[PDB]
C-alpha cells in the first residue's frame, strides 16, 4: 500500500535524450493525480482516452513512464498522427494513444549558457519509426556507393545531433521537458487506484 514514486520521476535531476529515451515500469500504487493536475505549474497538460478527473477515480492494471527533452515549437508533434523530425525519427505515439502527456518549461533547469551539447535527436533513416521504436544505433547509414567504414564524411553522417538550447532563445526555441504516461488494460487485476 505505497504511493507511486512520482517524486523521483518528475523531480528527477537528470534526463536522457529522446532517442535514448528512458523507461520506468511503475505499478501497485494508490494514485493521486490531482496533486499534479491542480498544481498549475505545467505549461501544457493533455491526453486522450480518459479525462484526468475521471481517471483519478479509476483503477488500472499497468502503466509505464517515459521522459525526454524536445523543443517547444515541436511540442505539438507529441500527438497521434503528427509529422516532423521527432515524429519520424525519434518518437511516434501510436494513433490509438491511451497514455498521458505533460510538459512544462525547464529553461531554468536544463538550458545552459553557450549551448547544452548533451541531448540528441535522430535525423535520417531508411524508413519510419514504429510505435515506441528505440534506435540507439549510431551506425553510419550509406546512401552512396563507396564503402562507409564507420568514419564520418561525404555520405550521411551520424543520425544523431544535439540541440543548442541557448537560454537567450525565444519561447518555442527553449527545451520543455516531457513525461509520457501510458495506460493499458489487460487480464491482470488493477494494481493502481485512488
Amino acid at each position, epitope marked *: 500500500t505505497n504511493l507511486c514514486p512520482f517524486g523521483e520521476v518528475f523531480n528527477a535531476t537528470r534526463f536522457a535524450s529522446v532517442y535514448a529515451w528512458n523507461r520506468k515500469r511503475i505499478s501497485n500504487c494508490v494514485a493521486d493525480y490531482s496533486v499534479l493536475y491542480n498544481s498549475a505549474s505545467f505549461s501544457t497538460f493533455k491526453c486522450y482516452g480518459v479525462s484526468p478527473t475521471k481517471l483519478n477515480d479509476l483503477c488500472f492494471t499497468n502503466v509505464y513512464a517515459d521522459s525526454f527533452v524536445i523543443r517547444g515549437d515541436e511540442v505539438r508533434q507529441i500527438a497521434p498522427g503528427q509529422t516532423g523530425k521527432i515524429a519520424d525519427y525519434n518518437y511516434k505515439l501510436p494513433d490509438d494513444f491511451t497514455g498521458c502527456v505533460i510538459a512544462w518549461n525547464s*529553461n531554468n*533547469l536544463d*538550458s*545552459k*549558457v*553557450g549551448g547544452n*551539447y548533451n541531448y540528441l535527436y535522430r535525423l535520417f533513416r531508411k524508413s519510419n519509426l514504429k510505435p515506441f521504436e528505440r534506435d540507439i544505433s549510431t551506425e553510419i547509414y550509406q546512401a552512396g556507393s563507396t564503402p562507409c567504414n564507420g568514419v564520418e564524411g561525404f555520405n550521411c553522417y551520424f543520425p544523431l545531433q544535439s540541440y543548442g538550447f541557448q*537560454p*537567450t532563445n525565444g519561447v518555442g526555441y527553449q527545451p520543455y521537458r516531457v513525461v509520457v504516461l501510458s495506460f493499458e488494460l489487460l487480464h491482470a487485476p488493477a494494481t493502481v487506484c485512488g
Partner: antibody
Amino acid sequence: QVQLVESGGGVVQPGRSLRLSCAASGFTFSNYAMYWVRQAPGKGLEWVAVISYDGSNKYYADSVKGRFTISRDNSKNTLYLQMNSLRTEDTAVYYCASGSDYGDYLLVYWGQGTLVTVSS
Amino acid sequence: ALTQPASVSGSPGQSITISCTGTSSDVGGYNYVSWYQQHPGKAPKLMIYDVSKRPSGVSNRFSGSKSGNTASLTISGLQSEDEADYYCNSLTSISTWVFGGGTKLTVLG
C-alpha cells in the same frame, strides 16, 4: 555544504598578467557554469566573463575582451582565471560566481572574493 | 548601464519603491529580472529573480515588479537591518551582460 573559496591575489603592476582561481565543494562542479563579477571600491558591480559548463564556450566583457582567459577542470573541480595585460582600472575585488541550479546565467552562491589592485 | 536612483530614504515601518530602468531590448523583452542585497563588505545575496521569485530563506516582505522598460522593487515594513545597498540585473541578448547600478537605502530613525 554549498561553499566557494577564492584562490587569492595581491598588488600588481600594469601591463603584466596574473592568474586567479576558486575552490568548490558541496555540489556537482561539473554540471554548472561559472562567472566572475568585479566591484570597484565603493561603487556598483560589473560582469566580467562567463565559461560554459564543459570548457566549450566563452564570453567576455567589452572592456576585458582580448585580455582575459578562462579555464576550468572537471577533475579537480577547480576554475582558473588569467588576467593578462593588467590595467589599473581593473583594480577591484573579484567574486567567484555560482552558476547555481534552479537557474541559468544568473548568479547565486557568490563566494567571498579576492581583492586585487593594480598600481605602480 | 541601467537606471537606478542614486539614493533613497524612509522611516521605519514605511514602504519604499526603487526604480530600475533600462532599454527595451533586454528588460522589456524578457522576464529576466534579478535583484540583490549586499551588506557592506560582505558577499551579495540573491533576493528576487525574473519576476518576484525568492530564494528559499528570504522573508516574503520583499516584493518586486517590472513595467515597460522599468523594474521596480517594493519593501514593506522598513527595518534597521534592511538598510543596505540594492542592485538589479537582467539578460543582455546582444551577447553581453549588464547590471543595474547603485542605490543606497537609508532608513532614518
